[PDB]
Design a protein around this ligand. Structure first.
Ligand code: CL
Lengths: 320, 320, 320, 320, 320
């Protein structure tokens, strides 16, 4: 019932072996204490007892001068990436540019490349959806917006905020290592494993310089990603403001038209009150007149028109 | 009538003893002046006369190379935590990973763990309530929102702001110690209590390194908590914007429908004015006609329909 | 007609003497140039020619190793504070914890304590007013808010912004001194006045350490005050957002009810148009029928009900 | 056709001479290359070949150990300031406090004083206008705001933003010089012009100290100005929020009153439909009844009142 | 099928030659590895193996002590700039002020000048469009805004945000080089290509000083551009707020007028209900009266006027 790790091991030749190992046995083999392998912090890079420990969300890796270990990889869809790219990248002529360099350089480059590719894929998925939703929402010919698109935009905005947080954490973790030279020196595990051998093995090539160059490359890539995400957020905010203004303008137009119709209706009712009063069954001295009916009707209609025009002019003066 | 402290003392063996002591007697025993134990600042960590003084809101602790003291603990529901975890953690094989290290390491680790657990519990309580309230509020099928949920959201937002302030203060206090090596050296109270003994007692193990590792661990945990809180705040703001847009859209739809009905009513009244005028009790030359009544009624109805259709077309053209 | 200062002098024994002195005479006595005592900057702390010059808004003080001077104190309600606390604090067993330390320590502590008490009093006055105003304004059962409370809230917000600016300036002034050790060394005026005497007078006590401790204490107090003010501002903003949402929801509810009533009125007018048409004084072939009147009335009422129900169903479908 | 400068020269005696000089001749006389005198950057202070070059928007100055030059001064209303203050300030007992110091101190002090006075005048002009406009706009007894005041407020806000940018640039330029001691040493042009002479001429007075004091003074003044501008901006934002809330409340009140009147009108029309139906010219069996007319009228009126009261109660229950 | 570069080469004499070269051949000739010429990062300036590599969006350049290379220039409208300015600038008396300096100074100055001119042109294009659109939108005499101008403003705001991001990146890239002296020393490729020759060739002129001056110039220009862009953004936000307030005020005015007309209509209908009731065909005891008709009509009209005036007074009291 002892806790165990599902370990995938890649040697210097690219060979891959998957098995399970007890936690205590792994601690004894790697020469590390338990507190080293807690993996409590997301996106942490550390060097303990000449071994590199890396965590990136769901990816947990341990780098040694002899081999690389991936821990707790199941149910993450990582099998395709592992078994189709890592043997080629570590022990081949793939996209890695650190082949003459020791193994740890290739391992770190592969891990950083995988994470940066994941982030780039997330952003490339997010961008078109947000762009098309914003384009649909800011259509000026729509009286009211579609609420399903609003919900979709809210979900995409939450996803974008999470992605931006991930990018910021990735940048900070790299920059912290880059700032201090001691960490860069510690990262060269092969050099410090056998210092006597590498004192003469290194043919004038500076391992710290190579590590700094690689980390600077990946930091710049992450910075570009962060800039793109920030621009997307700003665009979302501007589109929201434009939507608000459009809705207000539509409301104003509808209100003005309704007001004009109300003025017309009020004038019509006011001048029909005369006919209503004449319609009651009471005695009067105007029944005998012949032209009185047409005269009253004409006065009613002409006065309705004149008062409506006067009211419209008053409204125009008020609204300037 | 002299002021006193309610002191809970844990020795190196985990034994717990609770009593009361006069302030002057405590000052004399600990070798500290009164100004040292004012506890004026919330979340302060200091080292005075080779003794550590810590305050975290309602928790006041003094760490010595021989024992630990908790001050003013009553009416805080801390008795359960104290008497059920501290004897086990300090003098056992619990979650602490600093058992071979001196006592102050275990004490600091226990206090930091308790505070970080409190913060994590607060956040884990807050998150589902805010999430479900936001999900209920952004329902697009609701014409108007529920105000009780609004009040609940306001209270939860205030609580979240307070929690974020607490996390920021906790991060700053730790980072200030971590920046300077002198404070880290001072924190090793056991080493400086008997420097001659620990000059040879330390079997190549660096106490400052262990202190730095522990503080870095807790700082990273606090940073993760702060990131989660910030993401929650951003989500709240986005949900508020979505709610505003939804309310505006509903208002626009209702206004448009009301306008259309107003146009219909105005047309009906305008064409009924003809019947009202014909209804007055005045003489006319059109009474003898037979088909005039049906002709007038048909003209009224057909014209009402035509003018309503024309007005609707005008509205559609205006709103595009 | 020469410009003069109203000077209040406190000696090392706490005795207080108030008088007036010409500016040139004061410059000659204190050994300072005119440009030193311009007091142009609010909240400035400086050391010139072994004399400390301090300004905090309306408070102007000069600290010397022998005595303290307060300048331009009239018409500021400071007489009570001066004559009731300063003689006790400077030459007594009051709240000051720097009695064995030289005079300048007591003077600086008293001035900083007075300013921090003023800021705390301002915040403690401001907080309940804003809290109760916000509680009154966010009442969900009010159709519209009270504008007098809005004006009160605006005034209180302006006051809070001014207080926050004052706290920020106070923090910055202290932190600038705390950052550099040269300023801390200069602040010990008694030590540098007679360096030969204090070379042996100091019995192993570090004046710079005491000054650093005092300044750190007051900086922490100011930081706590700033945190409280920022939390209050955030609460105000959240309450404003909640008020906006409540007003929008009330408007939507009223608009929906008005729309339903408009639909009912339109249906009633449409079906009463039939009676209006039948009411005109024109010949027809339906007068002889007996049950035609009740039949028309029943059709009118039943159709009004049916069309109103259909319109309400249409509105419900539109609003989902 | 060679480009020329309109040069105003002030000697150490305050004498002023205005003329024009070719650019190449000026370069040869001042011992500077062309690229030095491009004046491309607004608010730049530099030292080249032991000569100080300063630009502040429209003011271009060159300071030498022997004299000061102002370049391109025409059509700027600077003639009054130049010919009425500079001869007095440079060679008199005016507001300058650096008379015993060399000429460059007086020149720099005069230029900085002029610029800070310009900024203070701009702020003192801006503040009352914005304050009175905001006071007029936030009047709670106004149903709608005045749009001309809105335009005035917009113009004043743009001016305030420009002024704040100018203050920030002025602060940054001074702080950059203050941070590095090399620039402060370079600024003492008189000392470096004849180092052998000033090696013994300086009677224990530190020129760098005086320069630091002067620059710190002007930096503090600029900081105070920036704080005032920021407070004004915050006040403007708060006033805008209050205006929004007031407008929303007025709209809600008007909408509620309109709704109540609509309910009354609908009830009246509904109960008048009965009279309209009775008014048609159709046969019925209720004509012979005497009290039927008064009975119908009384039922109509009483029912109108009762249904209006019921509807108002329903509205009150809905709005709570 | 090997990948190739379209290379434009400028020698020290300004002669230009365009051709194509395989990537491997270019790597071998320039003495650089493949990873050096990936050009993955936008706006990157680096020095590798005594060769400068620069990328600015679509511009890719390699600077050597002997010649300059532009890579992948087709389909970018850069042919005009290249063939009409670069031969003159590099080998002539043009705007460059670094003619006596080595070739790399002229090359870097030309590239930086081109980029800063591009940014200035973009801003000068953007500013008038945004200014005129904002002026048109904030017209207080317009009841509703024009939505096409809103779309134009949204597009221009997106363009401005992109431009501001570009300016920020350009500033950061320059400042990073300016901060460290090692990079400035590395930038002097001619000095390090033949250190023995330039140890005596340099006649007391400091190449690092010249590089620092040039980079500081361009950094200041970029800072001015960034300030202008930020001011434009602030102006846009203020204009949006003013537009919101104007729309709200117009809505309030229209609503008030509609409410007054509704009150009048309700009064008219209420007092016409009397005539409607009198109009029904039912027996009554008031037919014989003569003056009853005129009396009822006069009471109806006078009461309508009085109740309308009372209602208007009530509305005025409610709105204060
Ligand atoms: Cl509205």
């Amino acid at each position: 019932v002892a806790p165990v790790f599902t370990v995938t091991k890649f040697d210097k030749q690219g060979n891959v072996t998957s098995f399970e190992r007890k936690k205590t046995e792994l601690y004894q083999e790697l020469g590390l204490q338990a507190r080293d392998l807690r993996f409590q912090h997301v996106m942490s890079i550390t060097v303990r007892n000449n071994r590199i420990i890396m965590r990136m969300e769901y990816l947990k890796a341990v780098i040694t001068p002899e081999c690389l270990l991936i821990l707790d990889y199941r149910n993450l869809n990582l099998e395709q990436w592992l078994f189709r790219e890592l043997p080629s990248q570590l022990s081949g002529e793939g996209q890695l540019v650190t082949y003459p360099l020791p193994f740890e350089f290739r391992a770190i480059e592969a891990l950083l490349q995988y994470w940066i590719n994941t982030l780039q894929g997330k952003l490339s998925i997010l961008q078109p959806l947000i762009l098309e939703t914003l384009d649909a929402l800011v259509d000026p010919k729509h009286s009211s917006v579609d609420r399903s698109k609003l919900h979709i935009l809210l979900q995409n905005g939450k996803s974008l905020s999470e992605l931006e947080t991930d990018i910021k954490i990735f940048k900070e973790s790299i920059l912290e290592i880059l700032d201090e030279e001691e960490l860069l020196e510690e990262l060269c595990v092969s050099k410090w494993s056998d210092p006597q051998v590498f004192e003469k093995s290194s043919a004038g090539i500076d391992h710290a310089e190579e590590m700094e160059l690689l980390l600077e490359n990946y930091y710049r890539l992450a910075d570009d990603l962060s800039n793109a995400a920030r621009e997307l957020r700003v665009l979302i905010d501007d589109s929201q403001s434009i939507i608000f203004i459009n809705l207000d303008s539509h409301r104003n137009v509808m209100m003005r038209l309704n007001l004009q119709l109300t003025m017309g209706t009020f004038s019509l009712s006011l001048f029909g009150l005369m006919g209503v009063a004449f319609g009651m069954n009471l005695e009067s001295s105007l029944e005998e007149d012949h032209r009185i009916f047409w005269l009253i009707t004409g006065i009613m209609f002409m006065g309705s028109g004149l008062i409506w025009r006067r009211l419209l002019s008053f409204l125009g003066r008020q609204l300037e």
